[PDB]
Amino acid sequence: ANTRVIELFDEFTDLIRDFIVRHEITTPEYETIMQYMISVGEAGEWPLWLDAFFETTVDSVSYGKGNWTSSAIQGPFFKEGAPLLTGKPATLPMRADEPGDRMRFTGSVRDTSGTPITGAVIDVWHSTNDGNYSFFSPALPDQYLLRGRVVPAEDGSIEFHSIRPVPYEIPKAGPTGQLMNSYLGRHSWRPAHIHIRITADGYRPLITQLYFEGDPYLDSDSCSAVKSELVLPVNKIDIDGETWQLVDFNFILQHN
Amino acid sequence: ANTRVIELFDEFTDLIRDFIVRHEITTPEYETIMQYMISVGEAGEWPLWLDAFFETTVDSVSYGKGNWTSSAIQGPFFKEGAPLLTGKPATLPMRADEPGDRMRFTGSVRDTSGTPITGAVIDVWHSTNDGNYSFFSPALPDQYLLRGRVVPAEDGSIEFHSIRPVPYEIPKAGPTGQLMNSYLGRHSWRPAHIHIRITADGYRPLITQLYFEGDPYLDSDSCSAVKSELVLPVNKIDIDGETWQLVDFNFILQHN
Ligand SMILES: Oc1cccc(O)c1O
Ligand SMILES: [Fe+3]
């Protein structure tokens, strides 16, 4: 017996019973709830459904804002052991002719005092423009595509190269899409994002997400996960007729 | 409804977010809840789980208080198409030497006024002395045993014969069970009960349960299903091994 759970569960039972009474939750209503949950099981979407609606809140109690980088959710599609990119310019493993424009990501990783953190590993992950993540779609191999680890050079600079990401929409036919589009008459679009996770000994882990300026769904996140201080300016440099989206974010890790 | 599901969701959401924020629910925590909700769904347990925690309250929303036979929960163990029983004695289909105490039930099915209701049809099921329901158990056939339909006489009266039910315990090593035993530090034991569903045209269908005096889990039912007015007083009588437990109860339903 955990007393954390005896205390949380019992309050939580007493709340939901009251919700039921306040809102006259009927039996067929009930049977539909029960039934919808079941089908969230079957599509394997519990982690999407919950993160969709609640990661944002658990992430607000979990970390604080100040003079460093802000956390943001991790969502459902992170995968461990993604591969070290070393290279002439390091480039997310990706497909022959992987759809989209070329994107150069530059930046640095440092502590709340300015010092650069040579001992860090940035994991990145993002979804094809087709709108799937590797390891989690039947439209993509269980391989590491668009996922990789980067390491600050000894002066703290980071830079990698990938496609530039575009607005993702949660499968409109899954339980989560269906609630979102139909039952809620809304939408299931997220704005484009690069997911980052940075770790370093001596520092507190960072899980966050970089967004893009003027993004269609900037204010519309069907996951409600956006924070302005993370909406990024894009710049457009040509080299041999070839249009790099340039982006640049400077990470601060907190100590301990 | 597009509009009903909206009012509730958005209210359910807010509630749930406030829970998370108030108790500062951590990320490991959140992920533990995520897994438990997965587990429950990979066992076949939403119906048992949800029924155990809230069907009582869902049921209170849908009947009233008052004179109407005092409702109870269907459980997750109903089964359509139990056989009409006639035989003069009128017993529930059971195996030879079907274990345990033989039991006799008397009573009636009247309306608000007290006028016998003839179109009533009444189903009764329960579980073995060993604690199994027909059809949901490898240790019994997928065939009607201790499940049946009985029709009232012209004057009110009703009789069916079975064996006496005894306390049932919810699987000790599945998620519900674990929650009830390992994380909550309690038990998964429901009090001896006999299920009932009564029906008539021009009347609001009825569902409920009868428990017995001295039943240990009366006052700590795991699914909080027990209403004092549905505890049956037991009259121990011995027609010399076998030994009859005789009970009686007076059903009433509401009109239209
Ligand atoms: O990073 C994400 C978080 C939540 C839902 C998603 O579809 C996603 O890509
Ligand atoms: Fe994402």
From Swiss-Prot, chains A, B:
Q: What is its EC number?
A: 1.13.11.-
What does the entry list as the binding residues for Fe cation?
Y133, Y168, H193, H195
- Recorded superkingdom: Bacteria
Q: Does the keyword Ion transport apply?
A: no
Protein keywords: Aromatic hydrocarbons catabolism, Dioxygenase, Iron, Metal-binding, Oxidoreductase
User: One biological process GO term for this chain?
Assistant: catabolic process
InterPro entries given in the database record: Catechol_dOase_N, Chlorcchol_dOase, Intradiol_dOase_C, Intradiol_dOase_core, Intradiol_RC_Dioxygenase
Q: Name one Pfam family in it.
A: Dioxygenase_C
Mention one GO molecular function: ferric iron binding
- Name the cofactor(s) required for activity, per the record: Fe(3+)
Reaction equations catalysed: 4-chlorocatechol + O2 = 3-chloro-cis,cis-muconate + 2 H(+); 3,5-dichlorocatechol + O2 = (2E,4E)-2,4-dichloromuconate + 2 H(+)
The note describing how and how many cofactors are bound reads: Binds 1 Fe(3+) ion per subunit.
NCBIfam families tied to this protein:
chlorocat_1_2 (TIGR02465)
Q: Which family does it belong to?
A: Belongs to the intradiol ring-cleavage dioxygenase family.
Q: What is this protein called?
A: Chlorocatechol 1,2-dioxygenase
Q: Which organism is it from?
A: Rhodococcus opacus
This chain is encoded by the gene named: clcA
